[PDB]
Symmetry: D2
Subunit: 337 residues, 4 copies
C-alpha cells in the first residue's frame, strides 16, 4: 500500500570539509534534506585506522546536513547512515553519494522490472569481547534481518549490497561479513563468505549500523541495483556483471550513453589471498602501501569501464567473498516505458 | 641479410633472482650472444635512490656475462640494460630478453612488416647541458644512429624509442624532444613514442629503438597508441590493434596471448581534472607509485599478463604505449 | 599598564579532541577572552595536503568561540591560530594556549626581564609577490607592527617570530628575511629567530612575536639558540639557559619542569654531510617526517616533555629554537 | 694459553654496493681479511621484510671480502657473520663495522681490567614448525652456549651483546630472545626477557647464527664492551650506562676526547609497549612509518651523545628487554698503562 522511491545524487568534494556542492543540492530545492537516509563518501587521505581526514569528512557532512534540515547534529545519529571511506588514489574523485527515500501511496505505471529500495538496521550494542566471535555475528545478522524488513524485502536474491559499520578494538570485518552471510541464508548458522557484504570498522561507536541496498517488484525508484564478483586483482568481469545485471545490455564495452546510465558503483577491493596472479608473482601483499595500491587498482578498473571518477572504491585490508574474490555493486537508471 | 628480432619474457621473484633468466640460455632456448637489450621491472620504490633497481641491473649483467663466458664489462656497450623500478599492484617483476640476428634468407609467408631493433650511443653528456639544447641534438644524433643500425628510414615505422640519460623531469624532457627532432616530429611540442629515463652518473646516454621493416624476419610486429587521460584504455588497444590484432573492443583469450609485451610510460597528468572531476593524483605523496599502479591495472586488464613493462610516475595529458604482437607465417 | 603573558599546554588525542582545551576555560582556570594565540601540533603527515591539520585548526577555533560565547568568525583577527602538522615519535600532540593581559600594577620581586607577546597582520599578499621583495617588506611591516604591539623596541629582546603566509620553500624564505630586515639582522643572509609557515589561500599573513621586556608582569621568560647541525643539542640548551635556567650540561628533574614550552624549527640541512659522514636525510622520501622525528628526539631527551612544538622538515645548516621558562618572584 | 685479540674498524658506505673504503681497509695492509669474523652494517633502504637494498649490501660485502681473501664467496658461509640492518633514517650514516679476532700466545702487560672477546655459534637447522616455539628457543640457547664457549667465557655477567639471526616464515625474534635469556641464566628453562639480546629474522637461511660480544680477564683487545637499557623512547640513560660501564668516566656529558673513545654503539630500538610517554599520548604505535621513526629517534639519541653518525641503530618491530625497554651496547677503547 506504500511503495518506496529511492534516489541517488553524486556530488563532488574538493576536500574533506568541502560541503559547497552538497549544500547546493538542498538549497536549490533539488533534494529534500529530510528524505536523506544515507551518505556514502570517499575522502582524500590515507585510509588507515588513524586517517583523521576521514573523520573530518564525516563531521563536516553531518553538520551540513543538520543545517540543511534545521536540527541539531545529534538527531541524525540514528536517522542517517554516514559512511566515509578514506583514501582516494589515482583516478578516484572524492565525492559523496546522497541517498534519499520516501514512500508514495500509488505505484507508477510503466516502470520495467524491479527497482531499488533501501533498508537500514541497528545492532544491539557490541562489546569488545564480541568483536570477532559468535556474539558479533549474531548481533549483525539480526540487524541485516531488520534492514531487510525495513526495506520490505524477503528474498535474499534481491539483496545486492550490505554495508556494515562495526566497532574496532580484521576481526570485526570478518565477523560482520559472516553475520550478513547468515542473515542472507548464504551460510547456515550452525557452521564461508558473503558475496555482497562490504564491511567497515572503527571508532568507539558501539551500536552497529547496516545499510542495505536491494530491489523490489513494488519499487517506485527510477533506479535498479545489481552485483558481480571480482575474481582476481586484474578482473573487470565482476564490474561488468554488476552493471549488466543492474539492467544495461552490452557485450563488452559500454557506449557513452550506457556509461552515463551507471549512476554509482560500490566496489570493495580487499587484498588478494595469494601473491600469484595469472600464474605470476605480484608484490601486492609485500608492498608497504598495499592498502593504497589495492584501491588505486580497483579505481582504475571501475573508472576505465564507466568513465566516472566519482566512484565508491573501498578496501585494501588483508584477506582471510570467495577466495580472492571481491564484491561490487552497480546502481543504474531504470526509466518508465 | 635480414634481421630476426625475438623477445622472451621471464619472471623475477626478486631483483637478484636470475634463475629463469639463466635457464633461458642453459636450456639452449636462446643464444646469449644474440641478446641486444634487457628491459626489466624490479620491486622497489622507483625513486631516484631505489637501490633494488641497481641490484637488478647488476644481477642481470652478471648472469648474462656468465652465460656468454666473458667478463661483465664487455657487455658495457653491446647490450642495453634498462631496469625500471617500482612494480605496484598487478605488475609482475620480470625481464624482457630482446635478441637480434641477421639471417641470409627471408622466410616466406611472413605477413606485412616485422619487428626490428636498433641501438645508438650518445657522446658523453655534460651536466650543464643536461636540460639544454646540447643534450637534445646529441640524443637526436643517437636516435638517428639507432635508426641506421635498424635499417629503418621512415620515422612512421618507429614505434618506441627508449632513452637513458644521466641524473643530477628535465633530462626526460630534453631527451624526449631530441627524439621528436630526429623523427621529424618537431623541427629544430612532444614525441608520441619517446620513453625517457634518467639516472646514475653515466655521462654516456643509450638509445634503444623498436621499429618495423618490410625486410624483417621477426615473428613479431610492434605498434603504438596514445593514452589520452589517466583512465583511458584506448591508447593500449590502439597499440595492440596497429601491431596486428583485429578486434573491436575486447580481446579473446587467444588474442590476448598474441600480445608478447607492452611498454607503457605513465607520467603524471598535466592537470588534476579527470572527466570533469577533481582527482588527487598530483597532490598524493605516493603519486609516482599510484601512476604505475593505475597504468598496470589498465594494461593487465586488457592483456591478462602481469609481466608488463609499466614505467613512469614523473611529473608532467598524453602518454605513450607500444605493444609487440605475434606475426606468424601465412 | 604592564603585560602579563601566560602559557598553558594541553594535550590532544586527535585533531578534533578539544576536551582538556575546553576544560581550561570551564574550570575558571583561564579566561577565554585573554587568549591571543593557539599553537598546536597535530597528528598527520605535515605535507601541503594534510587535512588533519586543518581539522585541528577548525576544531580549536570552534571550541574557543564557544568558550567566548561569540561566533567563530570574530576570532579571525583577534587570535593567531597556528597548527603544525606531523607529530612523529616522541612528539605528543597538544595545543599551547597563550594569554595576554594588561595589569595596572607591576608585581614586586620579578627577576630580570619577562615574556611579552605581540601580533601583526600583513596587508593582503599577492600571488606573484609570493617569493619576491613585495612579500618581504610587507612582512617586515607586520613584524614592526607586532613589536609595537608588544611594546618592544630592542630587536635583541625578540626571540621568536612566527609567520604564516599563503601557499601556491620560497614563501618561508621570503617571510624569513622580512623578519631579518625588520629586526635589523639584514639591511634591505638569514634570521636567527624566524619560524615561517605557508599554506591555504589566506592572502593576509599573520605574525606572532615572542619577546622580553623589563616592564613585564609575566611569570615567564623566553630565550633562543641555534641548532648547529642535525645532531646538535647545544642550540636547545642555549635557548633554555638564556631563558634563565642555570645549568652546565644536564638539567635536574626540577630544572626540566621549569621549561614550559620549546619551539623548534627543524628544516632539512643544506648538505648531506654530518660530522664528516654521509647521511640519507635529503634523499629520504620521508625527509620531512624524519627531520621532525629527530628534532623531537633531541628536545624531549633534554626536557622530558613530549608536548613540545617541533616543526619543520622543509628543504633548506642552522635552525632556530626558542624556550619559554618559568620566572618566579624572588 | 691463547689470548683473544678483537678489533673493530668502522668504514663508511655511500650506497649498499659501495665497498671502496671497505676494500681499502685490506689493500693498505691495515687489516688482514683472514682475521675478519663478523661484518655488522647499516644500509640505506626501508628496513621492512622486503628491503632488497639490505640484501644488496649483504651480497656486495661478502663478494668484496671473498676477493680480499682470494677465496670463493661460499667459503665465508659459516666462517663470518654478516649482519645488515636496513634503514638509516636521519642522522644515521650507512657503514660497516669490521670485527676481527686472532689469538696470541702471550698476554700483553698493562691492559686495564677486562677486554673485548668475540664468540660465534650455529644452531641446528630450524624448521617452520619451530619458529616461535620451544624447539626454536632451545636450538638458539645451544648456539648461545656454543658461542660463549668459543669466546672462552663462562660468566654470563660478562656477556653484553648477543645478536641472533633466525629464519622467518615477530615470533622468530621473540623465541630467539628467549633462547638467549635461557642460555644466560636470565630466565629458567622451565618457564620474561633478555637485557642483551638483539634479534633478527629473514630469508630462507635455516641454520641460525649467533654473534656474541663479551669481556674476559684474559683478553688482549684494546677494546672493552658494556651495556645499558633504554627505559623509554626519550631516554638517554641506557646509552650513557653502556658507555660508562664500557669504561668512560663521565657524569652527564662526554668531552670531545671521551666521545672519540667510543668506537661503536649497538642499539636496538623496538617500538614501545604502550603509547604513553612521560604521562602523555604519542603517535609512535599508530604511525604508518613507525619502524622508520623508531630508528630515526634512536639514532638522534645515540648520535647526540657520541657525535658519531656511523652507529648501529636497528629495530622498529612491534613490542610483545623489560616492558618498553631496549638494549644498547657500547664498545670503547681500553689502552695500555
Amino acid at each position: 500500500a506504500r511503495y518506496p522511491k529511492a534516489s541517488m545524487h553524486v556530488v563532488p568534494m574538493l576536500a574533506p570539509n568541502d560541503t559547497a556542492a552538497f549544500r547546493a543540492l538542498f538549497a536549490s530545492g533539488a533534494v529534500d534534506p529530510a528524505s536523506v537516509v544515507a551518505l556514502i563518501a570517499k575522502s582524500e587521505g590515507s585510509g588507515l585506522h588513524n586517517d583523521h581526514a576521514r573523520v573530518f569528512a564525516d563531521v563536516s557532512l553531518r553538520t551540513a546536513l543538520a543545517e540543511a534540515r534545521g536540527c541539531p547534529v545529534e538527531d541524525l545519529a540514528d536517522s542517517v547512515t554516514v559512511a566515509v571511506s578514506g583514501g582516494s588514489p589515482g583516478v578516484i574523485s572524492p565525492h559523496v553519494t546522497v541517498v534519499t527515500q520516501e514512500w508514495v501511496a500509488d505505484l507508477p505505471a510503466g516502470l520495467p522490472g524491479v527497482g531499488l529500495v533501501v533498508g537500514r538496521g541497528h545492532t544491539e550494542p557490541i562489546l569488545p569481547e564480541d568483536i570477532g566471535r559468535t556474539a558479533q555475528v549474531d548481533k549483525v545478522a539480526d540487524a541485516v534481518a531488520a534492514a531487510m524488513l525495513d526495506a520490505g524485502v524477503t528474498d535474499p536474491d534481491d539483496v545486492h549490497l550490505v554495508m556494515v559499520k562495526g566497532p574496532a578494538l580484521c576481526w570485526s570485518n570478518d565477523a560482520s561479513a559472516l553475520g550478513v552471510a547468515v542473515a542472507l541464508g548464504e551460510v547456515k548458522r550452525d557452521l564461508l563468505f558473503s558475496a555482497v557484504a562490504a564491511t567497515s570498522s572503527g571508532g568507539e561507536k558501539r551500536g552497529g549500523e547496516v545499510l542495505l541496498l536491494a530491489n523490489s517488484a513494488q519499487s517506485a525508484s527510477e533506479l535498479r541495483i545489481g552485483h558481480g564478483i571480482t575474481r582476481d586483482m586484474a578482473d573487470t568481469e565482476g564490474i561488468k556483471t554488476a552493471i549488466r545485471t543492474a539492467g544495461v545490455d552490452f557485450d563488452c564495452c559500454l557506449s557513452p550513453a550506457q556509461q552515463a546510465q551507471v549512476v554509482q558503483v560500490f566496489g570493495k577491493f580487499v587484498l588478494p589471498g595469494s601473491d600469484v596472479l595469472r600464474g605470476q608473482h605480484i608484490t601486492a601483499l609485500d608492498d608497504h602501501e598495499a592498502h593504497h595500491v589495492a584501491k588505486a587498482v580497483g579505481g582504475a578498473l571501475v573508472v576505465s569501464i564507466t568513465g566516472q571518477p566519482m566512484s565508491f572504491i573501498s578496501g585494501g585490508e588483508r584477506n582471510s567473498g570467495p577466495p580472492g574474490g571481491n564484491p561490487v555493486a552497480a546502481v543504474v537508471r531504470r526509466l518508465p516505458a
